[PDB]
Amino acid sequence: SMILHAQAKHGKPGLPWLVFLHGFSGDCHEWQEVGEAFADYSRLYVDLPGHGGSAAISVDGFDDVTDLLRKTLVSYNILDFWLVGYSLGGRVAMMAACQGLAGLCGVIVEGGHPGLQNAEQRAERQRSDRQWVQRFLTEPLTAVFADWYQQPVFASLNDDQRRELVALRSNNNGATLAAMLEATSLAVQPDLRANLSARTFAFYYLCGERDSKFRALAAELAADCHVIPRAGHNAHRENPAGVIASLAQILRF
Ligand SMILES: [Cl-]
């Protein structure tokens, strides 16, 4: 059966694995600047459905994604690991941990939304996301991304940072990207605050000093929050030395 495309790097045999999950439009290169600091651990850089080398892999919902995740982990023979997810990757990570994974130590989430709290909020999100879908599904990505990185969550960016990101993300497939966006929209995602608060596994949170929206969301979660200095929503991209120190504080204790 099919499994997610991933890049594996081996570390010491007695340490767990660091399973890294990128955000929307990203690929398995997202966490590599950070991940490579943890030379003694094994690392698995995963490509989510519709991204990188997993572009052709199609999913309907989160269930399908977490089934691909369970199967990928089994193929790589990962029995002991941590799930590290950024934003979209952060949400598939929380979703996967709550459904249940064999040999999970803990989940580290960076700017991952734990879910909307009412049917009205979900209705707004579904409307706004369906707009984005058609935009990715038709229009040139190079133009769609220019608007994508102007959303309130990316406010803290300067135009120089924004130019680079639009250039990096434009190298993608809009149809597969749109199908993923649809399948895992925050509108369809349950409110996992209860399941996380149940404290079924170790759970940590990171977000940038400048990520006002997710700093706020963290206050609602039963988890430690590491606040990355001089960084925004994608804090590992702006301050990797900061994010390494935070992950090290957690993993090496
Ligand atoms: Cl990003």
Author numbering: 0 to 252
Which passages does the manuscript contain on this structure?
Re-annotation of the activity of an earlier enzyme in the pathway, MenD, then led to the recognition that the true enzymatic activity of MenH is to covert the MenD reaction product, 2-succinyl-5-enolpyruvyl-6-hydroxy-3-cyclohexene-1-carboxylate (SEPHCHC) to 2-succinyl-6-hydroxy-2,4-cyclohexadiene-1-carboxylate (SHCHC) by a 2,5 elimination of pyruvate from the cyclohexene ring. EcMenH adopts a typical α/β-hydrolase fold, comprising a core β-sheet of mostly parallel strands surrounded on both sides by α-helices. As is characteristic of the α/β-hydrolases the three catalytic triad residues (Ser86, His232, Asp210) are located on loops of the core α/β–domain.
Accordingly, we report the structure of the MenH from E. coli at 2.75 Å resolution, along with the structures of two active site mutant enzymes, Arg124Ala and Tyr85Phe, both at 2.5 Å resolution. Each of the structures contains three independent molecules (A, B and C) in the asymmetric unit but EcMenH appears to be monomeric in solution on the basis of size exclusion chromatography and dynamic light scattering (results not shown). In the case of EcMenH the helical lid sits over the loops containing the active site catalytic triad residues and form part of the active site cavity. A notable feature of the active site cavity is the presence of two anions that are consistently found bound in all EcMenH structures, occupying the same sites in each. The sulfate ion forms hydrogen bonded ion pairs with both Arg90 and Arg124, which appear to be the primary determinants of binding. The chloride ion makes one charge interaction, with NH2 of Arg168, and additional interactions at distances of 2.9–3.4 Å from the OH groups of Tyr85 and Tyr148 and the side chain ND2 of Asn233. Given that the SEPHCHC substrate has three anionic groups, the carboxyl groups of the enol-pyruvate moiety, the SEPHCHC ring, and the succinyl moiety, it seems likely that the bound anions in the EcMenH crystal structure indicate key substrate interaction sites. The structure also contains candidates, the main chain NH groups from Leu87 and Phe23, for the classical oxyanion hole of the α/β hydrolases. In most chains of the native and mutant EcMenH structures there is a conserved water molecule located within a suitable distance and orientation to form hydrogen bonds with the NH groups forming this “traditional oxyanion hole”.
